[PDB]
Amino acid sequence: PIPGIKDISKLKFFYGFKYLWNPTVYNKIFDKLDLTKTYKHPEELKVLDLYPGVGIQSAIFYNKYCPRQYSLLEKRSSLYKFLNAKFEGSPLQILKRDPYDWSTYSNLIDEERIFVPEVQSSDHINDKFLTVANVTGEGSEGLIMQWLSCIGNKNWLYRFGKVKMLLWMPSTTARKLLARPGMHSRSKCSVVREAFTDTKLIAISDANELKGFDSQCIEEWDPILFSAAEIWPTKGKPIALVEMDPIDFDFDVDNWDYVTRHLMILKRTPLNTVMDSLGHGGQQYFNSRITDKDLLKKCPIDLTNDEFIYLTKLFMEWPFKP
């Protein structure tokens, strides 16, 4: 049994990261997640913790599930040193490495065999591999775009199957990510998240932030609310917990990416004028394939992913395109 960390944590920098420190909340969250509904053999489970920070979540999770292996990747020296002292002698494996560098995994998993998960058939969420990560710091919006890309190509940690992942991140980032068609928050990442995953909002630190999300989704989600006080590094923006589960898809990622990339950079432009961005003569080509027309008056910001799939299908069938 590992020691729960309290306001000892009231002593570091964090580089823009924020952490929930109130154990009461984590319990509500873990009760809400009901992880063992999928991980029925926790003794067998292996967990990867990216940017643990204060290891409060790590100590609580471990204390509740005793996984086969819980590994924490902390790059920040002060925090690394902190965790190193607190959990000294614990079952937790604490390594100081950049969690957001491809080289780290190539070496810890492949080369050194320090942490190697069980690969499984992507017909169901991997049930022996779980990954948790804090992305509350700077550039979370970019890190997430990259993260998504790996689901699409099955790179990185996704080469092990459909692995569940719980991520903390600024609520503003969570609002773009979970944004639905038509919303102002709609961006390329919402479309990608829609296309490759089933993500649920599990917790948020500001009841005021819920208005940015879909009222209907907030319904189905019913996310645990908590305050700014339960977040250590104070005076920071509100954070949000998301459960990200990859899903199966059957379309051409390469072309789809090309099309969505172009259309979404002009997401506010009507579909009856934006097509020439795909290539010279694009509008005239597309106006001859698209019959519906009710969607010709829309904008990319209004389209669903299925509509995008349809649009890239037309793209590939574009004749005389060397």
Residue holding tokens 């574009």? Answer: 318
User: Binder to ligand [Xe] among 2, 5, 48, 259 (CB under 6 A)?
Assistant: 48
| Shorter beta-carbon distance to ligand [Xe]: residue 133 or 301 | 133
User: Binder to ligand [Xe] among 29, 174, 178, 259 (CB under 6 A)?
Assistant: 29
Binding mask 277-296 for ligand [Xe] (x = CB under 6 A): --------------------
How far apart CA 205 and CA 239 sit, in angstroms, is 6
Interacting stretch for ligand [Xe], rule CB under 6 A, among 41-49, 175-183, 204-212, 262-270? 41-49
Q: Are β-strands 93-95 and 125-134 bridged in parallel, bridged antiparallel, or unpaired?
A: unpaired
User: Binder to ligand [Xe] among 17, 21, 62, 65 (CB under 6 A)?
Assistant: 65
User: Binder to ligand [Xe] among 25, 83, 94, 109 (CB under 6 A)?
Assistant: 109
| Angle made by CA atoms 241, 187, 32, in degrees to the nearest 5 | 20
User: Binder to ligand [Xe] among 57, 136, 190, 199 (CB under 6 A)?
Assistant: 57
Interacting stretch for ligand [Xe], rule CB under 6 A, among 101-109, 179-187, 191-199, 221-229? 101-109
Q: Residue 123, Cα to own-chain centre: how many angstroms? A: 20
Tokens describing residue 246: 């990859």
Q: Could you tell me the maximum CA-CA distance found in the chain, to the nearest angstrom?
A: 69
Minimum separation from the CB atom of position 175 to ligand [Xe] (A): 19
| 20 annotated as belonging to a binding site for a ligand | yes
Interacting stretch for ligand [Xe], rule CB under 6 A, among 32-40, 76-84, 286-294, 314-322? 32-40
Minimum separation from the CB atom of position 119 to ligand [Xe] (A): 14
CB 226 within 8 A of CB 27: no
Minimum separation from the CB atom of position 177 to ligand [Xe] (A): 17
Minimum separation from the CB atom of position 139 to ligand [Xe] (A): 21
How many chain residues are in contact with ligand [Xe], going by CB under 6 A?
15
User: Binder to ligand [Xe] among 166, 169, 278, 301 (CB under 6 A)?
Assistant: 166
Tokens describing residue 38: 């999928």
User: Is residue 249 at the binding interface for ligand [Xe], with CB under 6 A as the rule?
Assistant: no
User: Is residue 182 at the binding interface for ligand [Xe], with CB under 6 A as the rule?
Assistant: no
Tokens describing residue 91: 């079952």
Binding residues: 20, 74, 98, 134
Binding residues for S-adenosyl-L-methionine: 20, 74, 98, 134
Q: Which residues bind ligand [Xe] (CB under 6 A)?
A: 29, 35-36, 39, 42, 45, 48, 57, 65, 105, 108-109, 115, 132, 166
